[PDB]
Amino acid sequence: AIEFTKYHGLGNDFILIDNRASKTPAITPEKAVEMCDRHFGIGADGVIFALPGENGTDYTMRIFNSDGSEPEMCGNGIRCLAAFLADLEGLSRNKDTYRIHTLAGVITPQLTPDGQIKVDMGLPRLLAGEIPTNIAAADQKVINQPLEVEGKTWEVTCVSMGNPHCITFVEDVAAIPLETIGPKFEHHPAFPQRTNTEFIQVVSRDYLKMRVWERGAGITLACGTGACASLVAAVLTGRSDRLATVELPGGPLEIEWSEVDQRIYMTGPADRVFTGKLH
Amino acid sequence: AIEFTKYHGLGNDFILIDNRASKTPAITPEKAVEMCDRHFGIGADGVIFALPGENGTDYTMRIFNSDGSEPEMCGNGIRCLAAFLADLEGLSRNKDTYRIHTLAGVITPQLTPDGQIKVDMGLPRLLAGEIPTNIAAADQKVINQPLEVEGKTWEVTCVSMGNPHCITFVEDVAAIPLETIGPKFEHHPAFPQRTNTEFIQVVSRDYLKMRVWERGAGITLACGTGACASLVAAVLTGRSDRLATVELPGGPLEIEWSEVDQRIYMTGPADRVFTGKLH
Numbered sequence: 440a441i442e443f444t445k446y447h448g449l450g451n452d453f454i455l456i457d458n459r460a461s462k463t464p465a466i467t468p469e470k471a472v473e474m475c476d477r478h479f480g481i482g483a484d485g486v487i488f489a490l491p492g493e494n495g496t497d498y499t500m501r502i503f504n505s506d507g508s509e510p511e512m513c514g515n516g517i518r519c520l521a522a523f524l525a526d527l528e529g530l531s532r533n534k535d536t537y538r539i540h541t542l543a544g545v546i547t548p549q550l551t552p553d554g555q556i557k558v559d560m561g562l563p564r565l566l567a568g569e570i571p572t573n574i575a576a577a578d579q580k581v582i583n584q585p586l587e588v589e590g591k592t593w594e595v596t597c598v599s600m601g602n603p604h605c606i607t608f609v610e611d612v613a614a615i616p617l618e619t620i621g622p623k624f625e626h627h628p629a630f631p632q633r634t635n636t637e638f639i640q641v642v643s644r645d646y647l648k649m650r651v652w653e654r655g656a657g658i659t660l661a662c663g664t665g666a667c668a669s670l671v672a673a674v675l676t677g678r679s680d681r682l683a684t685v686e687l688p689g690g691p692l693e694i695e696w697s698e699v700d701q702r703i704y705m706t707g708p709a710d711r712v713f714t715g716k717l718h
Numbered sequence: 719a720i721e722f723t724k725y726h727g728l729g730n731d732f733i734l735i736d737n738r739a740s741k742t743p744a745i746t747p748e749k750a751v752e753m754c755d756r757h758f759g760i761g762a763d764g765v766i767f768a769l770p771g772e773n774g775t776d777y778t779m780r781i782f783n784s785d786g787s788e789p790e791m792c793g794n795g796i797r798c799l800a801a802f803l804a805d806l807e808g809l810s811r812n813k814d815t816y817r818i819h820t821l822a823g824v825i826t827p828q829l830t831p832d833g834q835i836k837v838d839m840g841l842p843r844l845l846a847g848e849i850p851t852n853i854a855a856a857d858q859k860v861i862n863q864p865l866e867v868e869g870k871t872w873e874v875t876c877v878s879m880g881n882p883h884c885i886t887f888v889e890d891v892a893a894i895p896l897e898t899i900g901p902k903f904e905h906h907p908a909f910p911q912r913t914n915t916e917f918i919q920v921v922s923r924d925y926l927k928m929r930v931w932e933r934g935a936g937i938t939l940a941c942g943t944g945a946c947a948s949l950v951a952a953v954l955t956g957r958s959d960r961l962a963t964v965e966l967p968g969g970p971l972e973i974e975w976s977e978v979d980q981r982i983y984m985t986g987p988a989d990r991v992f993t994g995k996l997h
């Protein structure tokens with residue numbers, strides 16, 4: 440009986456649920472796992488709920504990963520939700536921005552004239568205790584630090600965008616055996632709440648190629664928080680400028696670590712694919 | 719604007735289109751590829767059209783694989799189509815069987831009282847010219863014959879159920895590196911029209927475990943024609959009885975090589991997942 444709309448942001452695909460009638464998500468994590476199953480269900484990297492605003496926000500977003508876990512933010516999902524909300528509001532919409540409550544804090548997507556969505560993703564979180572990771576002391580940053588994974592030592596940088604990211608810079612990202620090594624990063628003991636893992640090939644100081652093994656979703660075609668975190672990591676390690684294209688398997692995102700306010704801005708598309716109803 | 723219903727037969731999942739208004743399929747193979755894309759489209763192993771009957775048949779089935787190619791039959795798809803047709807006919811349905819025209823010939827699914835669908839899949843085709851394959855002369859069978867794949871020689875048996883199958887018996891089907899070796903069977907030069915490839919572990923004379931690399935669809939969770947062909951191969955090679963369970967990753971099928979009429983009967987489920995409309 441559940442009605443939904445399928446979206447994707449650069450092939451990071453989501454089931455969107457109009458949940459404006461209640462602050463309680465209309466499906467359980469267990470049901471979301473069934474729904475995200477690509478053969479037996481709808482198939483998605485996650486379920487995103489459009490929920491009532493909290494205080495001084497227009498709406499709230501909660502997201503369940505395809506493994507049923509609930510992360511604190513999702514950049515591609517915020518873009519999809521912004522597009523969904525605009526569709527729900529129709530001609531009642533009277534602004535080009537939404538203030539969206541998330542577990543990580545208030546996130547503000549802006550619908551731009553060319554059809555993209557530009558998102559104020561907030562300040563990046565750089566201390567180990569904020570990731571969280573045990574690679575360093577809680578009040579220390581985590582920049583080009585060692586992480587032993589299956590007996591090979593990787594150089595990693597950790598950044599949180601509300602959710603954890605572990606970024607490593609590589610010479611040939613297409614050559615990374617992502618299916619094998621991804622889960623070994625995700626579940627590494629150094630990450631108490633698991634991590635997302637980004638492998639980054641620096642093409643130039645304004646162009647990064649990224650592949651990701653996501654916490655709770657595995658190999659995805661794109662990750663907005665991960666692209667943000669990777670850009671931050673590239674700046675922290677002196678490898679890139681603060682404005683860059685991040686090329687993902689599904690396409691490009693434009694990432695800016697603003698010098699005006701030190702917040703991360705992420706611009707990309709959001710596509711409506713189909714509307715549906717569960718049997 | 720295209721309306722569809724998502725089904726799966728043991729996790730071999732399909733987009734079903736009500737195409738009764740015209741003998742022309744509502745979409746092109748190119749569009750089918752886009753619709754079957756799991757991240758950018760609906761996601762499926764294929765698109766199945768419920769088409770008008772052809773002289774002495776109730777309906778016609780055409781199927782596009784997720785790579786856009788058009789195979790001659792599909793067992794999981796026929797079961798899904800029979801369920802779909804029963805729903806479309808509703809209370810106007812006046813029988814428990816449909817005669818369905820396919821490229822392979824007339825196929826007759828039967829709606830059984832317990833909710834399963836039992837299909838008359840026709841006579842198996844055993845000659846090399848009928849597969850087609852060049853492993854043997856056109857008028858010879860292909861039973862426990864050699865096939866070199868990447869310098870390793872495999873023992874194979876070929877059977878056609880209207881579409882080509884290449885079956886090899888293994889000790890541990892779970893250990894087969896299917897992502898790697900599957901495509902090398904599929905596109906082997908011995909198979910002018912490519913082939914479906916089944917790896918079979920015989921548990922007992924009435925119980926086969928199957929994994930499949932499908933022509934035009936890759937790793938799937940189930941394949942009805944493939945299970946049929948594998949049972950035939952197991953009988954031809956003396957490894958199984960003519961009545962067996964074939965356990966697929968998505969669940970079991972009951973296969974019978976009837977001694978009454980020498981036709982193959984396949985019984986299994988069909989599940990309606992959701993209805994949808996493209997944006």
Ligand SMILES: *C[C@@](N)(CCC[C@H](N)C(=O)O)C(=O)O
Pocket residue numbers: 451504510511512513514515516602603635653654655656661662663664665
């Ligand atoms: C990659 C992304 N969808 C974030 C999804 C949540 C992530 N799997 C986690 O568990 O933290 C996004 O930001 O676009």
Ligand SMILES: C[C@@](N)(CCC[C@H](N)C(=O)O)C(=O)O
Pocket residue numbers: 730783789790791792793794795881882914932933934935938940941942943944
């Ligand atoms: C798996 C299949 N859907 C067959 C699909 C067609 C197959 N991929 C081919 O190209 O012959 C079935 O019989 O259940």
